[PDB]
Design a protein around this ligand. Structure first.
Ligand code: NAG
Ligand code: NAG
Ligand code: NAG
Ligand code: NAG
Ligand code: NAG
Ligand code: NAG
Ligand code: CA
Ligand code: CA
Ligand code: CA
Lengths: 705, 743
C-alpha cells in the first residue's frame, strides 16, 4: 500500500525516527530506549515498522494527537491552518476533524515538540541515538501515489512549475509556500521579480549595444588608427623591459574596432539609466515585500530568545580580507604573465588568462568557505539568527573580494600611475607597472568580467544539478517500500542551502550592477541565468532532497543591507569606470577644445587628428635618467617614439612635465564624476521619496478595506 | 443665568464648587441688527440648538452679562465625573498610577485619586471639554450635517472660545487654594530677571501642554548645542586673528613696493579709473582673518556638529516622549475635514512663482548695489557694502510678507483634505518661499558674482549693456560675510522687536477703544477676552524663524565662523521673549499633545544634507585658499617658480595676469580705456596667458591646475564628510541607556 497514514490505521505520520538495531554497546541502546520512552510518554504516538527493502532497518513513525497538538500550537502565536481556538470551533469551516490542518503546519508542530523535548536530535545522531528525523513527502515525483485520497500535490507542482516544459509558464507561489514554507515562497518571489525587471534592463542594454554597433563606419579615431599612412607611421615605445620592440599603433585595428562598441555614448547613457534602474528595483521590491507580507500569513510573533546546541578577533578577519584581495590581484597578474610568456592571438591570450584566474577563484572559494566557518564557530554564538547573520557578512565579504579584486585592479589600478619612459615607476621594486594601450584597458576588463560571469553561472549550475538531467537528455536524444523508507534514501539540504542560493544571486547582482558600464550586455546574461536558475532550484528542491520543515520570515534576510551597499557602491564605481578606464572624456575634450585654431588647425570641431595630436613624444637620447642599460639599444635605427600620456615634448622648457591638455582632461574627468554622481543621487532620492506619488497602488489596495 | 457675584479672580461658578473649563462669548440681539433679520434669528436658532445639545451631552452651563457692554454675554462650561471619565476613556487619556495605561471606569480603584479638580489638571479638563465642543453638532441644512465649535466662530455666531488663566501674571490669586501657576511661570520662567535659570519644562507642559513644552525643550537644547558651536567657532576665529603678521599675501598687498606698484585694470566700462592694488590693504587684512585654515577646520567641525545635534535631539525626543507619557494619545488620533473645503496646475504655478521670487531677489540685490555705487561722488568700501546690505535687507523684509500672503493664497486654492495636510502644505510652501527670498542674494554673491566675466578685451555682457560684476584679488568672501551678518542680525532684531511690540500695541488699542472710566473690577473671563487670540496656526511662525536661523548658521558657516555666536545670543533672548509674549499677551491656547516638532524635521535633515555641498562649494569657489595652496605646493618651485623651497612669496605678482591696453578689440566703443592715456598695460584678476604668446588671452596651465585642485577638493571633502556623518549616525544608539532600562 505504501500509504501516507498508519498501516491499517486512520492516522497521519509527521516524523520518522530511524534507528539501527543493535543485533546487526548497551549504553547506546539504553539511551535510545530512554529517549523514545520519554517521547512516547509526553503524549505522542509511536510505532516501529521493519523496512521492506532491508530487514535490518527498523523505522519508527509518530503521529499527532489532535488536542495536545492544537494546544501546543496555541502555545506559540499560530493562526488558522484568524487565531485558532476551540471556543471558536464552529467559526472556521472545517472539512474534517483530523485532516483540516495543513500537513506542513502539522510537521512544524511536531518538529517544535521534538526541539523543546529535553532529557539534541543532531547531538543524538552524532552519538547515534537517532540516525535521522524528518517529515514525509506527499507522493513520488516519478509516479503518483497509490492512495487516491492524497491530493498528489508534489507531482502536480513538479509538472506545473519545476519541469522545463513549463519554462515560460508563470510561477505558482501559492502552492509553493503552502507546501514548503515562507522561506521558499519569498525566495522564489524575489527571484521572479528580479528576472521580471532584469528583462527591462536587458532590453535597454541591447538597444544601447546595437546603437554602438551601427556606428563602426563613423568611428573616426578607429579609422585613423587603422589607416597605415596615419596609424602605421606612428611608432610606439616598448611597454616592457627586455621582451618588446617598437610597434606601430595600427596593429590594434581589431582591438580598437571592438572597443568602439563598448566605449561610445551608448555605454554612457546605459550606465546613467542603470543608475535609476537600481533604485527602481529597490523601491518596487519594497512594494512587493509589503504586498506579500500582507497577503500571506506573515503576522506571527517571534521568540524573544532562542537556544543553540553550540555555545577582539574581528581585526584578524580584516587581515584575512586584505590578504585575500592581494592574493586575487597577484593571481590575475601572474596568470597574465605566465600565459603571455609563451584577432586570435592576443584575444585568446586574454581569454585564457581570464579562464585561469576564474579557475583559481573557484578552487580558492572552498578555502574561504572553510576558514569563514571555522572562525565564526570559534566565537560559539549563543543564538542562531546571529550565527546566520555573521556567516552572511563574512562569506559575502570573502566572495566579494575574491570575485572583484581582479576587476577592480584592472579597472582602476592598471596603467593609472606609470611615469614616462625616462623615469618609470617600480612601486614594489623591480616590479614595473603594466600600461594599457591607447584605447585603454576597458576591453579586457570587459573580457574578464564576462568570463567570470558566464563561467560561474554555467559551471556552478551545471555541475551542481544538471548532471542527472543531462544524462536523461542524452538518453532521450542520442521490492515495495513505504514512503518513509524512500524519503530516507534521499539526502537533506543541511542548514544553509537557501543561504548558498542567496549567495549566488547576490554575487550575480554584484556582477550585473557594479561593472555595468564596461559590459552593457551583463543584464542579458543575468536574465538567462535566472530563467534557468528558478526552474533548476525548484526541480532540485522538489526531487533530490528530503522534505524541509517550513519556517516563518518576512524579509529575504541579511541581504537587503548588502543590496543597498552594492547599489550605492555601484553608482560611484560606474562613474569612476567611465571617467578613468574609458577614454570618452579625453576625446570629447579634444573635440571641443583642441581642434580650433588656438590649439588645433581645423575650421570646425572634429575628431580628425585626435590620435596624432594626443600622443606624447619621447627622446631616446634621454633614454634614462639613471644612465643604465636601456631597452632602446638596437631594435632598428629608430630615433623618436610615442607613448600614451599627456606630457610636454622634448626640448620644451618643462621637459616631460604634464602639459595643459593633461590638466584640461583631468578637470573634465572630475567634473564628470561630480556632476553625474550628484545627478544620480538626486534622482535616487526623488524616486525613494515619491513612494506616495509612485507606489500608492498597492498601499491603496491595503487601505481600501 | 445670573450676574457677576463680585470676586474677580474666582475661577469657579457662582455657587463656588464648579470649576470653569471654557467661556463661550456671543453677541445678543439687543444690538441694532442690520441687513437681514432672518439671518440673525437663524443664528439664534443655531446657537440655541448647539447649547441644547451641549446640555444634553452632560455639560453644565451658566451665563452672565458683561459689566460694561450689555451686549456681551459670557457662557461658562463645566464637566462633572460622568462625562469627564467617559470621554477620558474614549480618548484613552492616561492618569497617574503608582506600567501605566488609559483610564477606564472598570479600573477606578487602582488610581491615586484625591479629588476632581485636584486629580485632573485643568489643562486636561480644558482639552477634554474642547474635544466635546468640537464633536457636538447643532443642526443640519442643505442635506449636509453641520457641527463643530470652529464653524460657529468662522460664521461669526461666536466671537471667541477659550480656557482661562489661573490668575494675573504679576499678582497672586486671592483664593488661597489657587496654585497660581501663571504667577510662578512669570516670576521664574518669563520676566527676564531670570535670564539665566534653566526653564522648568515640567511646569510649562503642565500649564500649556506638550505642544508648547516640546517647542521650548527643543529651543533649550538648541541653545546648548549653539553654545558648543559658538565656543569652537570663537576659538577658530581667534586663532585666525592671532596669525596676521604671518599672512604673507596680505603683507604683499599692503607693501607699497609690491602691491602698490601693481596697476590694476579698470573694472567698469567708463565710470571708474585705473587703480593700484594697495588700496585694498584693509580688505586683505580682513580676509586673512576670515579666510585661514581655521575656517576650513571649523567647516569640518560644523559638518560633524550638525549630525551630533540631530542625533542628540533624537535621544532627547525619546527621553521626553517617555517622561511625558505621550505615546498613547499620540497613537489615538483623528482628523476632520475643514468646513472651508465644503491639481498639478497649482504645483507648476507655485514652482513658477518660486523661480520669479529667486530672480527678483537677485535683481533687488543688484539694484541696491548699483544705486549705492552711483550715489558715491569707516572705509568707504565697507560703508558701501553695509549700505547695500541694509537696503537689500529692508526690501527682503518688505517682500517677506508678500510671499507669506501669496503662499496662503496658493495653498488655499488647493483644497486641503484636513488640518494636518493644510499645515504641512503651508510648511513646504512657506519654507521654499523664505529659503529663496533670504538666500538668493547670498548664493548669488557666493557663486555667480565675478565668475564668468571675460578679459577686458572682450567682456561678457549678459544681454547687452549689463556688464558682469567682478571681485578684488582677495575675492568676494568678505562681501558675502558682510551681507550674511547684516541679514542675520537685522532679521533677529526686527523679528524680536515686532514680536514683543505688536501684541502689546494691539492690546493697548483694544483697551483705549473702551475709554469708559471703569476703574472697577472685572471677572476673569471678561478680562481674558480682551487678550489676543493667537490664531490657529500656533507655533508655526516660531518654528519657521528658528529653522531659517538654522539655515543661516549651517549653510554658510564656511564664510562666517561667528554665526553660532549670533545664533546663541538670539536664542538666549528668544527663550524669554517667547515665554513672555505667550504668558502675558495671549489667550490660553487649547492644550494638545505632539510627537515631535512636526513637518520641520524633514526640512532640517534636508538643510543638513545640503550644508556639506554648499560649504564645499563656498570654500572651493568663493574663497581663494585653493589657488594659494596650489601656488605654494606647485608654483614656488624651479620648473615654474624661482624659490628654492615651497613658499608663498611672490604669490600676488606671479598670479595676477597681464593685459595690453591697446588690445581692446570689437568695433563698439573704441575708446573705453585709452582716454586716460597714462600707461600701456594693466593687471587683472584672472589666470590667462599674457599678450603675445601663441594663445594670447586663453586660460593658462595655472587655471586648469587650480580648477582640478578645486574639483578634487570638492570630491574629497564631500565624500569624507558624508562618510563620517554616516558612521557617526550608525555609532550613536539613538536612545538613552536609562530610557531603555525603564521600558
Ligand atoms: C609630434 C607629432 O605627433 N607631430 C605630428 C606631425 O608630425 C604630423 O605632421 C601631424 C599631422 O598628422 O600630426 C602631428
Ligand atoms: C641631446 C638631444 O636632444 N639629442 C637628440 C636630438 O639630437 C634629436 O634632434 C632629438 C629628436 O627630436 O632627439 C634627441
Ligand atoms: C608678467 C610680469 O610682468 N611679471 C612680473 C615680472 O616681469 C617681474 O620681473 C617680477 C618682479 O621682478 O614681477 C612679476
Ligand atoms: C599691437 C600693439 O600695440 N602691441 C604693443 C606691444 O608691441 C608692446 O610690447 C606693448 C607694451 O610695450 O604694447 C602693445
Ligand atoms: C600597419 O602599418 C604598416 C606600416 O605602413 C603596414 O605596412 C601594415 O600593412 C599596416 N597594417 C597592419 C595590420 O599591420
Ligand atoms: C601704496 O604704495 C604707493 C606707492 O608705493 C603709494 O602711492 C600709496 O599711497 C600706497 N597706498 C596708500 C593707501 O596710500
Ligand atoms: Ca543553485
Ligand atoms: Ca524672534
Ligand atoms: Ca518668537
Amino acid at each position: 500500500p505504501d500509504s501516507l497514514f498508519f498501516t491499517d490505521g486512520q492516522r497521519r505520520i509527521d516524523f520518522i525516527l530511524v534507528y539501527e538495531d543493535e543485533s546487526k554497546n548497551e549504553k547506546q541502546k539504553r539511551k535510545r530506549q530512554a529517549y523514545e520512552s520519554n517521547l512516547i510518554c509526553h503524549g505522542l504516538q509511536l510505532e516501529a515498522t521493519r523496512s521492506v527493502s532491508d530487514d535490518k532497518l527498523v523505522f519508527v513513525k509518530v503521529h499527532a494527537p489532535w488536542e495536545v497538538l492544537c494546544y501546543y500550537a496555541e502555545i506559540m502565536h499560530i493562526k488558522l491552518p484568524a487565531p485558532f481556538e476551540k471556543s471558536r470551533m464552529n467559526d472556521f469551516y472545517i472539512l474534517d476533524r483530523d485532516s483540516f490542518f495543513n500537513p506542513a503546519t502539522r510537521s512544524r508542530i511536531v518538529y517544535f515538540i521534538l526541539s523543546r523535548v529535553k532529557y539534541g536530535i543532531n547531538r543524538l545522531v552524532s552519538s547515534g541515538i537517532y540516525k535521522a528525523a524528518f517529515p514525509l513527502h506527499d507522493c513520488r515525483f516519478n509516479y503518483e501515489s497509490e492512495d487516491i485520497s492524497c491530493p498528489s500535490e508534489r507531482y502536480l507542482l513538479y509538472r506545473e512549475w519545476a519541469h522545463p516544459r513549463s519554462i515560460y509558464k508563470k510561477q505558482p507561489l501559492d502552492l509553493i509556500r503552502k507546501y514548503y514554507g515562507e522561506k521558499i515562497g519569498i525566495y522564489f518571489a524575489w527571484l521572479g521579480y528580479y528576472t521580471q525587471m532584469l528583462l527591462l534592463a536587458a532590453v535597454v542594454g541591447v538597444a544601447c549595444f546595437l546603437y554602438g554597433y551601427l556606428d563602426q563606419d563613423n568611428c573616426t579615431w578607429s579609422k585613423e588608427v587603422c589607416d597605415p599612412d596615419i596609424g602605421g607611421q606612428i611608432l610606439m615605445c616598448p611597454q616592457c623591459d627586455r621582451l618588446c620592440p617598437f610597434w606601430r599603433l595600427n596593429i590594434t585595428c581589431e582591438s580598437s574596432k571592438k572597443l568602439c562598441i563598448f566605449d561610445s555614448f551608448g555605454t554612457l547613457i546605459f550606465a546613467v539609466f542603470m543608475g535609476v534602474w537600481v533604485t527602481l528595483f529597490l523601491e518596487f521590491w519594497k512594494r512587493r515585500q509589503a504586498e506579500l507580507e500582507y497577503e500571506w500569513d506573515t503576522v506571527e510573533l517571534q521568540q524573544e530568545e532562542q537556544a543553540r546546541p553550540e555555545y577582539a578577533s574581528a581585526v584578524f578577519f580584516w587581515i584575512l580580507l586584505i590578504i585575500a584581495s592581494v592574493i586575487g590581484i597577484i593571481v590575475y597578474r601572474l596568470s597574465v604573465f605566465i600565459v603571455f610568456s609563451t584577432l586570435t592571438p592576443q584575444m585568446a591570450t586574454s581569454i585564457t588568462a581570464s579562464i585561469i584566474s576564474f579557475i583559481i577563484i573557484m578552487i580558492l572559494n572552498t578555502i574561504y568557505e572553510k576558514v569563514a566557518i571555522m572562525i565564526t564557530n570559534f566565537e560559539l554564538p549563543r543564538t542562531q539568527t546571529d550565527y546566520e547573520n555573521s556567516l552572511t557578512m563574512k562569506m559575502f565579504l570573502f566572495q566579494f573580494v575574491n570575485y572583484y579584486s581582479s576587476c577592480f585592479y584592472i579597472a582602476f589600478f592598471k596603467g593609472k600611475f606609470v611615469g614616462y619612459p625616462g623615469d618609470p615607476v617600480y612601486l614594489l621594486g623591480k616590479y614595473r607597472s603594466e600600461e594599457c594601450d591607447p584605447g585603454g584597458c576597458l576591453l579586457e576588463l570587459t573580457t574578464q568580467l564576462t568570463i567570470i560571469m558566464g563561467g560561474k553561472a554555467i559551471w556552478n549550475n551545471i555541475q551542481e544539478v544538471l548532471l542527472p538531467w543531462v544524462m536523461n537528455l542524452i538518453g532521450r536524444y542520442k521490492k515495495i517500500t513505504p514512503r518513509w523508507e524512500q524519503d530516507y534514501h534521499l539526502q537533506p539540504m543541511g542548514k544553509l542551502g537557501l543561504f548558498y542560493e542567496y549567495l549566488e544571486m547576490i554575487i550575480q547582482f554584484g556582477f550585473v550592477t557594479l561593472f555595468v558600464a564596461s559590459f552593457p550586455l551583463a543584464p542579458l546574461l543575468a536574465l538567462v541565468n535566472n530563467i534557468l536558475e528558478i526552474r533548476v532550484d525548484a526541480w532540485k528542491l522538489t526531487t533530490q532532497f528530503r522534505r524541509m520543515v517550513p519556517e516563518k520570515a518576512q524579509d529575504i534576510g541579511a541581504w537587503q543591507p548588502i543590496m543597498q551597499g552594492i547599489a550605492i557602491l555601484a553608482v560611484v564605481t560606474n562613474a569612476m569606470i567611465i571617467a578613468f578606464t574609458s577614454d570618452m572624456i579625453p576625446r570629447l575634450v579634444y573635440y571641443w577644445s583642441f581642434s580650433i585654431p588656438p590649439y588645433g588647425d581645423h575650421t570646425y570641431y572634429t575628431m580628425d587628428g585626435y590620435i596624432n595630436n594626443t600622443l606624447s613624444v619621447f627622446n631616446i637620447t634621454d633614454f634614462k635618467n639613471t644612465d643604465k642599460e636601456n631597452p632602446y639599444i638596437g631594435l632598428g635605427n629608430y630615433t623618436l617614439c610615442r607613448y600614451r600620456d599627456f606630457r610636454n615634448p622634448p626640448g620644451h622648457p618643462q621637459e616631460y612635465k604634464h602639459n595643459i591638455y593633461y590638466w584640461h582632461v583631468i578637470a573634465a574627468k572630475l567634473a564628470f564624476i561630480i556632476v553625474m554622481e550628484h545627478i544620480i543621487y538626486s534622482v535616487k532620492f526623488f524616486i525613494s521619496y515619491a513612494i506616495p506619488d509612485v507606489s500608492k497602488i498597492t498601499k491603496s489596495k491595503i487601505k481600501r478595506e
